[PDB]
Amino acid sequence: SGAIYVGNYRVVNRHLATHNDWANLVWEDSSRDLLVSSTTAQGCDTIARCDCQTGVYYCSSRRKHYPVSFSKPSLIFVEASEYYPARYQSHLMLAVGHSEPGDCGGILRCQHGVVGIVSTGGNGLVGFADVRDLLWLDE
Ligand SMILES: COc1cccc(SC(C)C)c1NC(=O)N1CCC[C@H](C(N)=O)C1
Ligand SMILES: [Zn+2]
């Protein structure tokens, strides 16, 4: 679990969005596994606007942060789950690092701010949904 709170927006994994997220929907994209809902309170986070390919992510299944080198946002095949059919997920960045089901939503940060959130994983891999191209989050 986990979310980004920036301005009057809450960014979550689309597959973990709540009834309240859908009732206050701003934007969603199943191909990216992202959903953004509106909030009444001002957020605590800021978003990176950069091309960093290294950073640090929070891994809830270890209660720890780990450093990672990750690929540029791209279209990657993701196997069927209870949440989605087999498909290509876009704007996804892969890295070597621990992740399990439950780790989705953990934040990836570089020196410039929030880069994205955990969205997929596998046998020693962790994948992140990028948010750096969503310029409207800042206004
Ligand atoms: C952090 O997520 C994981 C980590 C290790 C393993 C796993 S599936 C295990 C059966 C190999 C997963 N789960 C996932 O990759 N997803 C299930 C939830 C939806 C995700 C999506 N964006 O489509 C895909
Ligand atoms: Zn950066």
Q: Are residues 121 and 87 in the same domain?
A: yes
Which helix (H) or strand (E) segment holds residue 21: the answer is: helix 19-23
Q: What residue numbers bound the domain in which 121 lies?
A: 45-139
Mark whether 61 and 38 lie in a shared domain: no
User: 55 and 17, same structural domain?
Assistant: no
Active site residue 21: no
Tell me, yes or no, whether 40 and 64 share the same domain.
Answer: no
Residues 63, 99 share a domain: yes
Alpha-carbon distances of 18 from 1, 14, 21, 38, 93, rounded to whole Å: 11, 9, 5, 13, 25
The reply to whether 84 and 130 lie within a common domain is yes
91 annotated as a binding-site residue: no
Helices and strands counted in the chain (H then E): 1, 11
- In 3D space, the residue among 2, 129, 18 whose CA is nearest the CA of residue 61 turns out to be 2
How many C-beta atoms surround the C-beta of residue 79 within 10 A? 10
22 sits in which H/E element: helix 19-23
Is 138 annotated as catalytic?
no
114 and 63 together in one domain: yes
Provide the residues around ligand 2 (an ion) whose CB is within 5 A: 48, 50, 52, 110, 112
Alpha-carbon distance values, 110 to 1, 26, 52 (Å): 20, 26, 7
Q: Are 108 and 57 in contact (CB under 8 A)?
A: yes
Burial class (CB in 10 A: 0-12, 13-18, 19+), 11: buried
Tokens 């949440």 identify what position? 83
The rounded Å distance from CA 95 to ligand 1 centre is 14
- Do residues 70 and 129 share a domain? yes
Asked whether 113 and 139 are in contact (CB, 8 A), the reply is no
Q: How many domains does the chain have?
A: 2
Method: X-ray
23 shares its domain with 66: no
